[PDB]
Design an enzyme around this catalytic site. Structure first.
Site, short mmCIF file in Angstrom:
data_model
loop_
_atom_site.label_atom_id
_atom_site.label_comp_id
_atom_site.label_asym_id
_atom_site.label_seq_id
_atom_site.Cartn_x
_atom_site.Cartn_y
_atom_site.Cartn_z
CG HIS A 1 1.41 -6.79 -12.67
ND1 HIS A 1 1.84 -7.07 -13.95
CD2 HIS A 1 1.40 -5.41 -12.50
CE1 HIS A 1 1.99 -5.98 -14.56
NE2 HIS A 1 1.73 -4.90 -13.75
CG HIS B 1 0.56 3.36 -6.25
ND1 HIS B 1 1.29 2.19 -6.35
CD2 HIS B 1 0.74 3.85 -5.04
CE1 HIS B 1 1.83 1.97 -5.20
NE2 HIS B 1 1.54 3.02 -4.32
CG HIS C 1 0.21 -2.18 -5.06
ND1 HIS C 1 1.03 -2.99 -5.78
CD2 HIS C 1 0.19 -0.92 -5.59
CE1 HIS C 1 1.53 -2.19 -6.72
NE2 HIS C 1 1.02 -1.00 -6.67
CG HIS D 1 -1.74 0.34 -10.37
ND1 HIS D 1 -1.08 1.14 -11.25
CD2 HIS D 1 -0.99 0.07 -9.32
CE1 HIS D 1 0.08 1.38 -10.72
NE2 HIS D 1 0.19 0.72 -9.51
CB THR E 1 6.35 -0.35 -6.11
OG1 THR E 1 5.01 -0.35 -6.52
CG2 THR E 1 6.65 0.95 -5.33
CD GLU F 1 3.55 -1.35 -3.91
OE1 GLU F 1 3.71 -0.39 -4.69
OE2 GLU F 1 3.95 -2.54 -4.10
ZN LIG Z 1 1.54 0.68 -7.83
#
Ligand SMILES: [Zn+2]
Ligand SMILES: [Hg+2]
Length: 255
Positions: free
Chosen positions: A60, A115, A92, A90, A194, A102
């Site tokens: 992911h 994050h 996004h 990590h 999240t 996010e």
């Molecule tokens: Zn995250």
């Protein structure tokens, strides 16, 4: 669960009813409604002794993990009480430069979001931490497409090695200090993870100042695969969750 039409965020609630809980994340930061709280202490980031171990594609996103058996890289100060230890970071990111973060600021979407996940040490392990309302602390940093970020290149270059889901690579001597903006001014609010289990244990600290990354740096992110080796190729893009209702919560600003 994933980020596709058939298993996307609109479907998570089915397996994780907490999806429509009382303190879900991410949210929109309305800079005019945010409350300047003069009682907020400056953040203290002590990452000088950080120990990176590896990087892995978890299907992911990609996680860079750190040795958290001792107070090596910690976060304190700010709206926190006690010491929080880094466990992993990590990102996004989106398919295009116009989406990927996010959290949003006055509805603006950034190209990516970083994050840095930390867990409250009075709880002894990450695993007990996620059973508490104050178990985690996530430092969020926006990424905007501009000039290259020196400090990010070591990550970029190793991505080839962890292309599909399940792959990992030794990743030592990475200094996370290379990813921080100049200023530590931030917004904070009580929220959640999240991604599934979407546990409501997080104190969010979102930095006002974004870091800039080059088009070529973000491109490489987009070359990663959701799928496992030897399966139909699905690019790892738009691995972000849309903003959730604030529902009474109040976002405070340190500035
Ligand atoms: Zn995250
Ligand atoms: Hg919790």
């Amino acid at each position: 669960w994933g980020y596709g039409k058939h298993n996307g965020p609109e479907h998570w609630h089915k397996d994780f009813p907490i999806a429509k809980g009382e303190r879900q994340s991410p949210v929109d930061i309305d800079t005019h409604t945010a409350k300047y709280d003069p009682s907020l202490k400056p953040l203290s980031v002590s990452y000088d002794q950080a120990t990176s171990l590896r990087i892995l594609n978890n299907g992911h996103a990609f996680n860079v993990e750190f040795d958290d058996s001792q107070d090596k890289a910690v976060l304190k100060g700010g709206p926190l009480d006690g010491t929080y230890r880094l466990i992993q970071f990590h990102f996004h990111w989106g398919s295009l430069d116009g989406q990927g973060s996010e959290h949003t600021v006055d509805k603006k979407k950034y190209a990516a979001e970083l994050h840095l996940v930390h867990w409250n040490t009075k709880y002894g392990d990450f695993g007990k931490a996620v059973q508490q309302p104050d178990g985690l602390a996530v430092l969020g940093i926006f990424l905007k497409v501009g000039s290259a970020k020196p400090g990010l290149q070591k990550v970029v270059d190793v991505l080839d090695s962890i292309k599909t889901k399940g792959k990992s690579a030794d990743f030592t001597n990475f200094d996370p200090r290379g990813l921080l903006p100049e200023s530590l001014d931030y917004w904070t609010y009580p929220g959640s993870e999240t991604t599934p289990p979407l546990l409501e244990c997080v104190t969010w600290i979102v930095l006002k100042e974004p870091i800039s990354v080059s088009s070529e740096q973000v491109l490489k992110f987009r070359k990663l695969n959701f799928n496992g080796e030897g399966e139909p190729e699905e690019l790892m893009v738009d691995n972000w969750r849309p903003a959730q209702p604030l529902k009474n919560r109040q976002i405070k600003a340190s500035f």
